Design a protein around this nucleic acid. Structure first.
Lengths: 100, 48, 116, 143, 111, 50
RNA sequence: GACAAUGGUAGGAGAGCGUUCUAAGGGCGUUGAAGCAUGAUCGUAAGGACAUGUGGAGCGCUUAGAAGUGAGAAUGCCGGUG
RNA sequence: UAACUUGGGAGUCAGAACAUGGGUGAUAAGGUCCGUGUUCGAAAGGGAAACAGCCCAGACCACCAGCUAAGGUCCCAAAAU
RNA sequence: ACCGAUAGUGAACCAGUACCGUGAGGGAAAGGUGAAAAGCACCCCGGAAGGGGAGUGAAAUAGAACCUGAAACCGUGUGCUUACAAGUAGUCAGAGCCCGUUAAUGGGUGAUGGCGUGCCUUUUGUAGAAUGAACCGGCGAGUUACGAUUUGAUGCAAGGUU
């Protein structure tokens, strides 16, 4: 089966044993995490609705706490001596689902 | 010691160099403006 | 003392030529032409990062429209019905359910019709 | 990133037949174009072909409205100095009814490389008989 | 095993030589000799001596038989240019490039 | 007239697709054993048959 | 931790990168310096390392000092090549 | 939530369109000369097919999240045949 | 706390020389094998130049056109792709086919779809059919002396300073 979870700003579709990428959390590498907000569950079992499912947590374990690839931001205006250059690396958090 | 020297706080400052690229803020026209008598080499009018 | 060039001009010009690999003809060989195209690539990518979000929302809505028409109703009345019930599931998740779970989507079209 | 993308490994195409008797020319052409592209499927992908094949029989007795039988005119130019041709829509119906339907539908599809391929799946016949019986075409009703 | 010979600083334009080299690239040694002897171009006799020198290297320096040999590589490279002038009208002079090439031929037994 | 733009190396090499020379057109001499041109005499022993 | 601000030409203000030489201290190098070439590396930017080939004798680091101190354009000057 | 005073350093003195109040011209001009607002200049993004000056609206950076403005919902082309 | 061969005298080298002008007069370019010539005896292809071995040497891709040897430009061989298509040549999305890294949500190529008229200067306003640049490399533009004023720092103080 699968569930829909809200991990801050966005939503994810998760199964069991699947590894996912999210935005940075306050947990450490190795400890357990719980998703308290689940919007939909399907599969063979009875479909549950919305706005929030009563309980129905999801558990996962943290794998790595890293940053994404660097992208260079560059803009300019023609015939006007104006330009800017910036780097950026977005931090993420890796998780593996184990119990819906 | 001769290998650890330090001038007093706030006693030195680096000079400004013009005509060294647009990012400095004084790149092309070096702060003079556009096409006048005061934008030529040799200056303009007398002080009075 | 006299300060000459060397090992500084070549180093920064090679960095620009190395970012233009794969470009056509002299746009990956000559520094002056390559420098112009690398600036345009950065300007294009800034614009395209924000157009990529408008391109994918349109794709999901098109798929939700096709699935809903199979249940004798349009997209506009589907989103009104879900809103009047409080599903709060975004367009990205509704599209992924209609493609995969055919009879789970029918569980959501009914409640959208129950509230009219 | 969760979005599904269809590709040639899993595209399924089928055949349809549509009757063009007693219908308005433009109201039928707009509906056929939405099928050739694949706008009626839940796996629509912009950069790959997904639509189905359409057979249009009884291309005659396609009906206009108003005075379009004499007023609507089609122009073309042969790219030679001073050569421009003309024909009336009521005159093309009785001498080339297949081109009348075919050009109207092709005007509703994008003019890309994929648009030309997507327009090659339309077959129009002026009578009630078609030779594509090797496939298994299905009857289609217009929305 | 391969053997090679080089002719350096040949006073012929590099892109006039390459036309002949396109015919003998990949042919048997006995067939390449005949093609060069029957083609009526200026650079054919020059390339003839380079292939003959490389064939004789495979018999004395090495131990290879000249019946199983093929022309493995045949290319031309640019050399120094001789700079001259030509008096034109109205008191002007135009430059003339007398070009030069390096010719290399490699013959292989196979393997 | 004079050229308006520099010609690139891609366009220059396309134009030289057909610029090349052909094979001499030779046959084997069945008295010499070596190659000769068709309808021309042999150059080894200088014989011409037929 | 709570709130607020951050489009920009002429032009004003502030903080920095890199280059050659000097002083003091501390180091590397034929078991291989500088230079050159390649690479899927690091920092918000100017930019800094590491590994492998070539090379055959010099060169970095820290804190200060002084400048012939940064090039894409002047129908710019000189050389090479289309 | 600004304003006034004293010191160091400037650039600017070729402006344009739209609406409106007038002179001049012919109740002509994408004309010209003044008063009053806006935008461009020095402003990217959405709409007007394309279109510095018109309508909406002011980009610190990243996201395959949500609600709206002008303008729109038969097909091209997202949403009412 | 001067230069290091486009620098420093025009001239590091047979330079006021080659060369140019009736004459007065104007004026360049050109340094580097190796510690030691130990500067390749001898054999093979050729008329010769040139080369392949064998030797010298730590090294010959150090062989006198000789330290290092960049870019433009010219060639040979190969992985992916291209002959119904309207292109400021890129960017975002994306199958298929090949590889394997400074090991990390990796590298090469690209069937298709969306968006998109170079850079500088000068202008009210430039894709502009307004200016400039054929390409690559080196060189090429707010400095110093003596006075005035203002700001920061430091020493002494009704005195400060030669």
């Amino acid at each position: 089966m699968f569930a829909i979870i809200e991990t801050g700003g966005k939503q994810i579709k998760v199964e069991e044993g699947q590894e996912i990428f999210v935005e940075k959390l306050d947990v450490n590498e190795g400890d357990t995490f719980t998703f308290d907000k689940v919007l939909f569950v399907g599969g063979d079992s009875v479909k549950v609705g919305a706005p929030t499912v009563e309980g129905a947590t999801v558990t996962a374990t943290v794998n790595k706490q890293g940053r994404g690839k660097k992208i260079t931001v560059f803009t300019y205006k023609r015939r006007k001596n104006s330009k800017r250059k910036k780097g950026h690396r977005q931090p993420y958090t890796k998780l593996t689902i184990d119990k819906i | 010691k001769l290998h650890e020297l330090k001038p007093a706080e706030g006693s030195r400052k680096e000079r400004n160099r013009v005509g060294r690229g647009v990012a400095t803020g004084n790149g092309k026209t070096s702060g003079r403006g556009h096409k006048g008598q005061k934008a030529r080499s040799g200056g303009g009018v007398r002080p009075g | 003392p006299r300060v000459k060039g060397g090992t500084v001009t070549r180093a920064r010009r090679k960095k620009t030529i190395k970012l233009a690999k794969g470009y056509f003809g002299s746009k990956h060989t000559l520094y002056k032409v390559a420098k112009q195209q690398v600036m345009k690539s950065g300007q294009y990518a800034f614009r395209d990062r924000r157009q990529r979000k408008r391109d994918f929302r349109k794709l999901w809505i098109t798929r939700i429209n096709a699935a809903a028409r199979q249940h004798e109703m349009s997209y506009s009345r589907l989103m009104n019905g879900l809103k009047k019930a409080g599903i709060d599931i975004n367009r990205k998740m509704l599209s992924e359910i209609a493609i995969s779970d055919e009879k789970a989507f029918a569980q959501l079209v009914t409640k959208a019709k129950d509230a009219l | 990133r969760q979005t599904f993308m269809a590709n040639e490994s899993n595209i399924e195409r089928k055949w349809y037949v549509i009757d063009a008797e007693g219908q308005t020319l433009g109201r039928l052409s707009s509906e056929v174009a939405s099928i050739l592209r694949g706008k009626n499927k839940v796996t629509y992908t912009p950069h790959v072909d997904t639509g189905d094949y359409v057979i249009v029989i009884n291309a005659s007795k396609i009906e206009f409205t108003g005075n379009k039988e004499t007023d609507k005119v089609y122009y073309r130019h042969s790219n030679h100095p001073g050569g421009i041709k003309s024909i009336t829509a009521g005159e093309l119906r009785r001498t080339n009814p297949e081109r009348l339907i075919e050009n109207s539908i092709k005007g509703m599809l994008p003019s890309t490389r994929l648009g030309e391929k997507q327009g090659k799946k339309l077959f129009v016949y002026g009578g009630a008989e078609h030779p594509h019986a090797a496939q298994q075409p299905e009857n289609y009703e217009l929305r | 095993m391969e053997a090679k010979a080089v002719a350096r600083t040949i006073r012929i334009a590099p892109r006039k030589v390459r036309l002949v080299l396109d015919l003998i690239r990949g042919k048997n040694a006995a067939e390449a000799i005949a093609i060069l002897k029957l083609t009526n171009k200026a650079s054919s006799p020059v390339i003839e001596k380079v292939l003959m020198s490389a064939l004789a290297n495979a018999e004395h320096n090495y131990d290879m038989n000249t019946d199983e040999l093929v022309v493995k590589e045949a290319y031309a490279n640019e050399g120094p240019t001789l700079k001259r002038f030509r008096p034109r009208a109205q008191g002007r002079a135009s430059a003339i490039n007398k070009r030069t090439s390096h010719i290399t031929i490699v013959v292989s037994d196979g393997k | 007239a004079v050229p308006k733009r520099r010609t690139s190396k891609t366009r220059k090499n396309k134009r030289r697709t057909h610029f090349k020379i052909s094979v001499p057109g030779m046959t084997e001499c069945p008295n010499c054993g070596e190659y000769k041109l068709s309808h021309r005499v042999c150059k080894n022993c200088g014989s011409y048959n037929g």
